A = this chain, B = another copy of it.
């Protein structure tokens, strides 16, 4: 029945909002639709895998909020294996390489590639993290898909192919489905292209020893019985003095304040009284989540290490079920495993097959890519298709189709009376990640502490001190990288010497 704040959803965002509110002295109830916490993070434990993240997993430098929350809860990180060579597989052939980026040899191609990654960052510098619709060319960029932007920028097929795979990997969606403004914002707010794509020194450097699921789990341990499992919220009433929140299993909760810590579109699953304002009413129907299957294939040993590969594969082409892999072996060197994502339209297509048919297609790809028969000899397999989840809607996160971010963007974290909004989609730094869930969660909680007159307005957005355990190297460019011209740029320099 009664409390200070009801928090809808017990994902990392929800759970962090509740921990902060509870730490301040308030009575909080967490209402969770599922028979578990973690939401888009999930750690499976059985004797074959010991543990494994089937959802959100990677953390790295500049993500200091999740690093600190998890450290306070007693968790450690280990480094993802990047000791040996990465592999770029392209037109059915594998090209090993070190350093974060696959090298490019053809000099026209090299100019195209260097110029695309650079323009992404150039364009990002014009887009404010906390208000992407305020970019100078916001309308123009939002009225274009990433497919159109790529068609314009990329003067070689090789760059366009690589860029496309980047978009798919990064946002689990096709280039033609996403707003250019949105995607450009999404990359910028993670610290730019290098930070977002890297293992060493980037978004993929690390994982939690024991799995990311322990973050949500351990906050539930702190909160005890204030977390209610199997309580899908169906109904929110704001017409009376206190807010009434109703659940499917028929309970009623009453509070001063609500934090909604669910995917924006999952707000649809709740009936509102009074009705939502028009903008939010239509916004929650415009913001789908991408499609992905996360697959892990176990082997008796990390056999790729012996051929001097780390396990990272960037695999091109339509025929490949999985376009990106990472070593998923434990710190100890056991439970050898390759993690792979089946992305976007391929998550839709290959969902038709059986678990076993997917296992096979993957082993056959890895065998081809790593050039190793051993890859046909898996000891175990685990997969999750996030597309089938009623209480996630997809993964990793929410994408914005063309024309939406500028028309409805401002509305995402605009409070509706006594409803305040968390969830990683409303974050301003690493939105779409476990990091952004922690940011949005703590900031929504702090918005309420302000409404309650417990803290000053200037205390709502709070900066985070850098992890001492996971420090960030700065992102460096070279002189040439900065100043070498585009393909159209070389061309113009040729039409000018010739005259």
Interface residues of A (CB under 8 A from B): 142-145, 147-148, 174, 176-177, 232, 234-235, 248, 265-266, 268-272, 275-279, 281-282, 285-289, 291, 345, 348, 351, 385, 387-390, 393-394, 401-404, 407
Contacts and interface: CB of A to CB of B under 8 A. Distances in A.
Contacts of A394: 282, 285
Contacts of A232: 271
A408 to B, nearest CB: 8
Contact of A285 (B145, B289, B388, B407): B289
A277 B387 CA distance: 9
A105 B357 CA distance: 63
Contact of A401 (B289, B387, B402): B402
A174 B248 CA distance: 37
A400 to B, nearest CB: 10
A177 B234 contact: no
A388 B275 CA distance: 8
Contact of A147 (B143, B275, B286): B143
A268 B265 contact: yes
A401 B177 CA distance: 7
Nearest to A385: B278
Nearest to A232: B271
A388 B281 contact: yes
A268 B268 contact: yes
A145 B402 contact: yes
Task: List 7 tightest A-B contacts by C-beta distance, closest first.
Answer: A268-B268, A278-B388, A143-B176, A401-B401, A177-B403, A278-B387, A275-B390
Contacts of A345: 407
A385 B269 CA distance: 23
A361 B279 CA distance: 22
A174 B279 CA distance: 16
B387 A282 contact: yes
User: So how many copies of this chain end up in the complex?
Assistant: 2
Contacts of A291: 282
B275 A393 contact: no
Contacts of A403: 174, 176-177
A387 to B, nearest CB: 4
Nearest to A394: B282
Contacts of A275: 388-390
A230 B29 CA distance: 30
A25 to B, nearest CB: 34
A227 to B, nearest CB: 20
B282 A390 contact: no
Nearest to A148: B148
A19 to B, nearest CB: 28
Contacts of A176: 142-144, 402-403
B288 A285 contact: yes
A152 B1 CA distance: 60
Contacts of A248: 234-235, 271
A277 B407 contact: no
A285 B391 CA distance: 12
Contacts of A402: 145, 176-177, 401-402
